[PDB]
Design a binder for this molecule. Structure first.
Ligand SMILES: COC[C@H]1CC[C@@H]2/C1=C\[C@]1(C)C(=C(C(C)C)C[C@@H]1O)[C@@H](O)[C@H](O)[C@@H]2C
Ligand SMILES: COC[C@H]1CC[C@@H]2/C1=C\[C@]1(C)C(=C(C(C)C)C[C@@H]1O)[C@@H](O)[C@H](O)[C@@H]2C
Ligand SMILES: [Mg+2]
Ligand SMILES: [Mg+2]
Ligand SMILES: [Mg+2]
Ligand SMILES: [Mg+2]
Ligand SMILES: [Mg+2]
Ligand SMILES: [Mg+2]
Lengths: 236, 6, 236, 6
């Protein structure tokens, strides 16, 4: 609504400025306004959208984890009762986090996914849909936790299936999707074996395709492959 | 230290 | 208004949590709610108030400087006209920054300053009043710029005069006030000589009083004295 | 690089 009176190109130009200023909340609002213009996003605009919310939500997740750890320590045997403040403030941060995830999932469903027919757009948006359901799952504790997890799984799975059919094993989006789906396996779905196998198979298949790349594509793919390697090193 | 995502 | 229904102690407890979570906007709102309770602040609560707004406004200032630099480069001979977006977005950031400064100056005037009778509270609040008028001055360009600067100067000057009469030369608040008043001289009032003399005299007078301190007070004072030294090194 | 304030 709020960015309704600004030109699409102006909102894009301003998202890039807000990125430069590390003003990620602003960046995210500008890109939400740009999506709400109703036109499809270019590659670079998809990247701006994803970086804006990634940073916003990444700050909320880190805060929620600081607060969750405090809360847990207060619930330990021998801890002094300090009343409801930690739980209230964790719940506040948690609610704001869920609101951001719902807003991104809303933009995806209305109407980015349905108009995305190329592999690179459609896999990109489905990966984001898996990511934001995953951030939901990180804080979920009630009746819907299983459905949240399975919505993350299903979105990552359809992205995987398209990426396997339509993209080279070294494509950065294919590689980043597999990195995140492997994290989902490891710490959300309690399947560390699947997490490891996925990261390993993904890394190995990318290695064998490096030879097809220019030096700049090489750089782009190996950057992500290292994050796969970092996880395998941590997990094994 | 913390696993990577992107 | 917004924190009106929360207990003072709860708002304090939550400001400390938000600090831990680096949620400085939240921290600042909680401490604003605590001040609005109408009771005087303790030493530790004054520190929470000042750190919250310092961080909030420090993020806005850094963003404004990134945007101001871009704007200036766009106004250079041979630059391509990219329309009004940079100036609009700088103005947005600038307006939000001015709103934060006005909110802090409002809390000081209503009614922290008038009830602060001890040196340590009154110098602390007057220093903050000089700081927030100084942040105002950093972005001021119109009819009131001279009055803004002089309001910063006057607040720092009354803090200096009280601190000189009532506090030891090594007191951290006396030292931090002098550091900031010397920065004001250097980059706001265009008086680099006064800036240097103030930082030098302040450092030297603190050195000669170190001998009166415990090891923990020594640590506290020398920490600030190093920031005075860093500025003298940069400026000379 | 940048002058200090506190
Ligand atoms: C939807 O998930 C997007 C996520 C999948 C992998 C990666 C993503 C995001 C951003 C935009 C990029 C990188 C780096 C690897 C540079 C981190 C950035 O956040 C792009 O440059 C990559 O080409 C690629 C699209
Ligand atoms: C109103 O201006 C407050 C500013 C003046 C000097 C310093 C200030 C802030 C904070 C709260 C402190 C430090 C450090 C030096 C640790 C940085 C923190 O921002 C306190 O520990 C110091 O005792 C002292 C009050
Ligand atoms: Mg238009
Ligand atoms: Mg006890
Ligand atoms: Mg289409
Ligand atoms: Mg009460
Ligand atoms: Mg030209
Ligand atoms: Mg009093």
């Amino acid at each position: 609504g709020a960015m309704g009176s600004m030109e699409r190109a102006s909102l894009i130009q301003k998202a890039k400025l807000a990125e430069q200023a590390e003003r990620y909340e602003d960046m995210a609002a500008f890109m939400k306004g740009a999506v709400e213009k109703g036109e499809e996003l270019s590659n670079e605009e998809r990247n701006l959208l994803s970086v804006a919310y990634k940073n916003v939500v990444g700050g909320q997740r880190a805060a929620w984890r600081v607060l969750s750890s405090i809360e847990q320590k207060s619930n330990e045997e021998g801890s002094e009762e300090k009343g409801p403040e930690v739980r209230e403030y964790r719940e506040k941060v948690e609610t704001e986090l869920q609101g951001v995830c719902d807003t991104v999932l809303g933009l995806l469903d209305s109407h980015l996914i349905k108009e995305a027919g190329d592999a690179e757009s459609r896999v990109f948006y489905l990966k984001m849909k898996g990511d934001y359901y995953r951030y939901l799952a990180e804080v979920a504790t009630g009746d819907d936790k299983k459905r949240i997890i399975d919505s993350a799984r299903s979105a990552y799975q359809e992205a995987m299936d398209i990426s396997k059919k339509e993209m080279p094993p070294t494509h950065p989006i294919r590689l980043g999707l597999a990195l995140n789906f492997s994290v989902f396996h490891y710490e959300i779905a309690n399947s560390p074996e699947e997490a490891i196998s996925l990261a390993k198979t993904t890394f190995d298949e990318a290695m064998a395709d490096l030879h097809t790349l220019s030096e700049d594509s090489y750089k782009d793919s190996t950057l992500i492959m290292q994050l796969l390697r970092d996880n395998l090193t941590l997990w094994t | 230290k913390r696993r990577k995502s992107v």
